[PDB]
Amino acid sequence: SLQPPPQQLIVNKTIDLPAVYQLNGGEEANPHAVKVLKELLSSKKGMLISIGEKGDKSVRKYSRQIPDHKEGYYLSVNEKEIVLAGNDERGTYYALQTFAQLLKDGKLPEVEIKDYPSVRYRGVVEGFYGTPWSHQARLSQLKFYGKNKMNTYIYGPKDDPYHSAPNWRLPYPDKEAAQLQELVAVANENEVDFVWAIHPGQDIKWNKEDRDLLLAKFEKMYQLGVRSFAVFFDDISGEGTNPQKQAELLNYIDEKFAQVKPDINQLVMCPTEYNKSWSNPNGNYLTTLGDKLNPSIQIMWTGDRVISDITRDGISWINERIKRPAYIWWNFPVSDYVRDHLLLGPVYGNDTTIAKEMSGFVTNPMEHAESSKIAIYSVASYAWNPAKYDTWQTWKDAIRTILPSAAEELECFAMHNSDLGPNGHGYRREESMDIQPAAERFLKAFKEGKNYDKADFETLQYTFERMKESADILLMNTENKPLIVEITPWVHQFKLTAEMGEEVLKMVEGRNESYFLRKYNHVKALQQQMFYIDQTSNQNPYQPGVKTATRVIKPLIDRTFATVVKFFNQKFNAHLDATTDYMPHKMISNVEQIKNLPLQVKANRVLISPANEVVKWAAGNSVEIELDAIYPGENIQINFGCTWGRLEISTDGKEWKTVDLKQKESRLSAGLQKAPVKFVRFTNVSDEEQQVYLRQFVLTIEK
Numbered sequence: 038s039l040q041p042p043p044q045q046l047i048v049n050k051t052i053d054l055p056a057v058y059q060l061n062g063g064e065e066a067n068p069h070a071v072k073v074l075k076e077l078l079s080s081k082k083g084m085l086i087s088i089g090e091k092g093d094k095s096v097r098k099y100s101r102q103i104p105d106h107k108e109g110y111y112l113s114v115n116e117k118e119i120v121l122a123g124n125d126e127r128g129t130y131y132a133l134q135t136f137a138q139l140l141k142d143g144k145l146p147e148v149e150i151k152d153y154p155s156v157r158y159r160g161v162v163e164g165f166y167g168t169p170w171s172h173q174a175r176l177s178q179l180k181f182y183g184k185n186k187m188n189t190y191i192y193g194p195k196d197d198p199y200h201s202a203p204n205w206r207l208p209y210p211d212k213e214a215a216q217l218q219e220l221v222a223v224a225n226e227n228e229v230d231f232v233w234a235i236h237p238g239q240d241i242k243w244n245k246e247d248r249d250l251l252l253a254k255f256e257k258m259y260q261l262g263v264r265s266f267a268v269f270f271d272d273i274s275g276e277g278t279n280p281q282k283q284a285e286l287l288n289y290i291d292e293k294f295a296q297v298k299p300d301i302n303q304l305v306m307c308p309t310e311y312n313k314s315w316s317n318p319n320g321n322y323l324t325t326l327g328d329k330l331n332p333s334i335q336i337m338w339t340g341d342r343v344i345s346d347i348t349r350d351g352i353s354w355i356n357e358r359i360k361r362p363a364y365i366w367w368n369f370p371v372s373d374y375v376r377d378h379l380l381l382g383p384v385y386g387n388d389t390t391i392a393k394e395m396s397g398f399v400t401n402p403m404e405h406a407e408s409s410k411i412a413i414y415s416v417a418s419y420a421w422n423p424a425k426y427d428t429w430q431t432w433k434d435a436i437r438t439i440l441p442s443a444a445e446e447l448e449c450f451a452m453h454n455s456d457l458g459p460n461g462h463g464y465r466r467e468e469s470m471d472i473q474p475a476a477e478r479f480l481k482a483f484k485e486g487k488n489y490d491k492a493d494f495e496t497l498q499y500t501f502e503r504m505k506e507s508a509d510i511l512l513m514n515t516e517n518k519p520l521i522v523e524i525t526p527w528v529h530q531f532k533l534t535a536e537m538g539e540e541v542l543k544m545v546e547g548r549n550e551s552y553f554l555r556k557y558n559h560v561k562a563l564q565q566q567m568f569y570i571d572q573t574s575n576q577n578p579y580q581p582g583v584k585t586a587t588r589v590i591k592p593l594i595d596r597t598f599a600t601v602v603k604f605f606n607q608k609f610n611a612h613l614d615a616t617t618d619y620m621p622h623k624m625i626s627n628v629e630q631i632k633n634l635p636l637q638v639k640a641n642r643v644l645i646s647p648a649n650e651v652v653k654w655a656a657g658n659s660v661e662i663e664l665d666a667i668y669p670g671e672n673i674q675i676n677f678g679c680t681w682g683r684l685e686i687s688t689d690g691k692e693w694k695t696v697d698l699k700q701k702e703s704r705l706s707a708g709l710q711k712a713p714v715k716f717v718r719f720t721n722v723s724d725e726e727q728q729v730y731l732r733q734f735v736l737t738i739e740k
């Protein structure tokens with residue numbers, strides 16, 4: 038209804054937008070708010086509309102109703118008068134943003150509102166690894182922040198070469214500089230502080246030469262319009278991690294630059310130890326920063342872990358040490374460590390009562406800018422009014438705002454694209470919770486030979502139908518073309534999941550052998566299509582491919598497919614393959630966890646899925662990979678957790694050529710030097726059983 042929800046709102050009657058109005062204070066009030074107001078409109082005889090900041094003539098009558106907080110405002114609508122009065126210029130702009138949401142069909146509700154943020158700095162840090170947001174995406178983002186009362190945008194793409202090492206020393210070229218100039222201007226028009234960050238720690242020298250280069254870079258950005266600045270020391274090693282040096286540098290920028298210019302706003306640093314588990318208690322890095330860094334300077338913090346939600350105990354832990362309220366860097370929805378997943382679910386987990394305990398709250402988003410508006414909108418609501426923060430309603434409101442013409446379809450898509458999957462940070466999100474109980478019940482019964490509930494079967498049927506509807510509708514949506522460009526690969530994979538799910542359910546209901554077999558063949562072809570999408574879309578270097586509906590739906594479908602094929606093989610004494618993911622290559626083994634470990638293709642690599650359990654490698658047993666063709670080989674790398682095995686390659690499986698594995702901490706490796714390869718074979722040739730841990734088994738070929 039109103040986002041963010043105001044601190045104070047008074048319920049009844051309806052007032053039409055005055056066809057004739059008298060404007061009071063258009064020449065004294067925030068020009069950015071006036072422009073918004075004249076846009077919403079279209080003389081002295083008419084109804085009075087008072088706009089202005091506390092102190093202006095236009096609103097002196099309502100001085101006692103205007104909240105005495107920065108960015109606060111007072112809004113009133115009744116039959117005779119409209120009041121739009123901020124405590125300051127940004128507060129007046131934020132009054133117009135709320136006013137704009139109130140306007141419906143030219144009709145306004147009779148309301149009185151007192152409002153202001155609970156958290157002083159609220160917004161976004163473009164701080165991820167990956168392709169930095171496009172210029173057109175950044176322009177759209179700033180307008181979005183202004184509409185949602187987010188007042189902070191911290192520019193810091195890790196892979197922008199003029200942000201980080203070594204070319205943080207170099208001024209932006211004319212083209213990029215002109216774009217940053219535009220960004221800064223658009224930010225100002227939308228009441229957003231543009232904070233330009235620099236990331237010099239990996240190669241900074243603690244000498245005068247690098248100090249001066251950093252300040253000269255800051256001066257250039259200031260000439261481009263930048264009035265807020267940040268220095269990042271995250272994700273570095275070496276002398277740059279020295280807290281005393283970091284604090285002296287930031288205090289120098291403060292005293293010789295930030296407090297020398299007339300109009301610099303935020304000065305922010307992010308530390309090397311930026312979460313609790315990365316803090317070494319055997320030293321005292323954080324208390325050195327807390328005590329030496331000038332108190333006006335902000336210190337960023339991601340929580341108890343690199344990826345974590347903010348708790349009351351956690352914020353108190355850090356605050357005691359840095360001697361000031363932490364400026365939260367919240368690592369959601371950033372996906373740069375799970376780049377084959379979209380993270381489109383609700384924003385939750387952050388304590389709603391600790392607004393006084395944080396200096397700021399910013400979200401690190403996905404490199405998918407439009408897709409991140411779901412989380413950004415929700416953080417905007419949370420940060421402005423946490424006590425009233427409504428996780429699910431705000432998620433639904435965000436989707437309806439981003440894609441009104443297809444909000445139900447985006448909800449369906451987002452609901453099943455929210456978990457991260459397994460990852461090194463251990464961070465997960467709920468997903469598909471609506472249908473998860475019916476999936477769990479259906480699969481337990483089916484596996485056990487008990488009757489499943491008809492209602493559960495139909496819930497699954499319904500889900501797959503709605504998934505196909507939503508996929509096809511989103512693909513053709515033209516209301517937010519940039520969004521659809523971002524999600525399309527996942528949309529394609531999402532539809533394929535839904536079609537597969539339908540066909541497996543028909544295998545469950547199947548009543549004759551011929552019909553079952555058509556469905557089985559259809560499922561296999563769909564598996565092959567998902568493999569194709571996984572290999573040709575989103576081919577980034579770290580987590581290539583496209584994964585969707587991974588927490589609940591894909592396991593349901595795969596396990597149901599496997600179970601019904603097992604039942605068919607039993608019933609008809611048949612030997613249908615029950616594999617659930619297409620794999621063009623083959624692998625066979627006499628060792629067994631390995632025999633059932635699936636191969637994977639990632640870029641030009643062919644690898645055995647690593648396991649976690651003990652692999653007992655018997656005396657004579659082996660593992661042999663057979664590729665679907667002859668390829669020029671690059672290397673083989675193995676990791677067993679070696680005077681017992683023998684690595685051989687071949688083009689025909691008859692004539693073999695032994696390859697010698699080189700040993701090292703990084704472990705068993707061997708170059709192939711473009712030799713043709715189709716078969717790789719690893720055979721235990723010693724006499725005692727050798728138990729191992731397959732951490733990796735990877736062949737790389739030239740494509």
Ligand SMILES: C=CCNC1=N[C@@H]2[C@@H](O)[C@H](O)[C@@H](CO)O[C@@H]2S1
Nearest residue numbers: 164165166271307311337338366
């Ligand atoms: C307060 C400092 C936090 N800085 C961080 N730098 C890194 C970010 O650039 C990543 O996007 C993020 C997710 O992979 O992990 C850490 S968090």
